[PDB]
């Protein structure tokens with residue numbers, strides 16, 4: 537009767553993608569939250585911060601919510617057959633299938649974006665269509681029971697939506713007030729539509745080698761789905 | 764053109780509200796000339812208030828002199844406000860840090876360390892009455908700056924002030940690049956993050972739920988204030 541919520545925790549994850557929604561969802565009644573990898577134990581995020589997986593794939597309980605974070609480590613995941621199989625198996629019966637940042641590219645490599653509206657991190661957005669998605673340039677995109685968010689803390693925001701659907705709006709509002717979640721960034725450069733032009737160009741340049749590498753990974757992942 | 768590292772340290776204590784720390788950590792760790800640290804008595808596991816396990820990277824003694832110190836909040840603050848070794852470390856680092864910062868009830872720890880005397884500061888809304896006994900001038904704003912002190916009450920206030928720190932340590936374009944590279948653009952689906960905007964029933968239940976903790980924390984705060992010299 538507890539709601540089972542699971543985050544995939546993989547090497548080189550962007551940890552805030554996971555830790556943001558974790559702190560929101562773990563505050564709810566009647567929830568048990570899991571950090572899933574191939575075995576329990578330390579997993580190093582892209583920043584070097586060390587997290588602890590709490591369960592192996594095989595020992596994870598059937599999940600009501602699955603959440604795939606993004607980060608540097610996504611490229612490996614997109615070609616990891618054991619991880620992709622776990623994600624597919626959980627998604628087949630989960631109430632909610634979710635991702636943050638380039639975690640949606642992992643859902644895509646698993647075949648779970650076929651014909652679905654979805655978003656990802658803005659620098660990699662061109663990789664959605666080859667994975668079968670209908671690309672949408674919005675912060676949180678919902679298609680049926682699929683929720684994808686692009687930005688680093690998009691999971692915090694969609695976690696509050698999930699709280700309201702799993703429980704009720706008053707429960708989501710209570711968590712927001714108890715945590716005093718009231719963001720107010722001091723700059724307006726969180727979207728390529730609003731950042732200075734030179735900032736867009738430099739951010740793109742810093743992502744270019746990763747995007748080039750992920751283009752080839754994405755093409756291979758798409759070809760494997762077709763074959 | 765300097766690439767001298769900015770040493771940025773977060774105090775990682777048992778029963779921390781982990782997002783207070785993990786938010787600004789991921790923002791600041793994305794900068795090429797930042798070195799971040801997670802500090803406790805020893806390196807090793809530290810369990811957050813949710814049960815999520817974090818890992819301290821350095822003891823107090825082995826921590827390099829910090830340029831930024833950040834104290835998070837959470838259930839564990841009550842113990843920390845009467846932890847002499849931790850408070851001494853905070854004072855020593857604050858004395859030579861370019862910026863002294865806190866999130867949520869981390870400012871009550873700064874207060875217990877004697878660092879809020881006569882300073883404008885904020886904390887989590889449910890505990891805001893505990894600032895004045897620690898010498899602070901209480902201010903009800905999301906992020907409050909006084910000299911080199913920055914305090915913020917909300918769970919992710921450190922994400923927001925991390926961008927301010929990036930702009931002052933480096934330049935505005937660098938802060939904007941962080942924000943875009945991480946695509947940080949929050950848009951909450953509810954407007955209940957303040958007692959001034961949440962539904963009345965929600966405020967009532969949150970205040971009732973916090974009452975026991977406020978009562979105990981007031982007792983702790985009074986002892987911590989008594990220990991402050993003079």
Ligand SMILES: [Cl-]
Nearest residue numbers: 836837838868
């Ligand atoms: Cl607290």
Ligand SMILES: [Cl-]
Nearest residue numbers: 687688689948
């Ligand atoms: Cl975001």
